[PDB]
């Protein structure tokens, strides 16, 4: 394994001197909002392109069925 020159001091605490699932209920709305802020633009771009092109195609398909309609 490689040799990485590094100067630090690392502290770790035991898993049994800590809570397991009690900060999830506190950090849950902040995590939700941070996720949507970080990935908001791409999800919006994907949704707008997909649903707009699908709606345009479906509208034109209905128009073409009505154009041949007796």
């Amino acid at each position: 394994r490689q040799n990485i020159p590094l100067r630090e001091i690392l502290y770790q605490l035991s898993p049994y001197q800590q809570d397991v699932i009690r900060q999830t209920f506190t950090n849950a709305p902040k995590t939700f909002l941070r996720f949507f802020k970080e990935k908001g633009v791409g999800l919006a771009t994907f949704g707008v392109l997909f649903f707009g092109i699908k709606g345009y195609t479906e509208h034109e398909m209905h128009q073409e069925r009505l154009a041949e309609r007796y």
């Binding site: 394994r1 035991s14 898993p15």
Partner: protein
């Protein structure tokens, strides 16, 4: 200790320790207990706390 232990008492206390007492003391102090680990120098390959913590007990028994 608040006193001076005579050497006869220290010898009698040492002479009362057998293999059962060593087993019981190690079972009280070591087995499946948290420990403290300190290191210095070239320590990039020293295992972390969970590696040390899992090797305080035996699943084979």
């Amino acid at each position: 200790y608040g006193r001076r232990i005579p050497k006869a008492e220290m010898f009698a206390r040492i002479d009362a320790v057998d293999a059962n007492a060593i087993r019981a003391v190690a079972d009280r102090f070591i087995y499946d207990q948290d420990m403290a680990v300190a290191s210095a120098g070239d320590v990039q390959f020293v295992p972390d706390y969970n590696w040390f913590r899992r090797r305080s007990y035996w699943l084979r028994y």
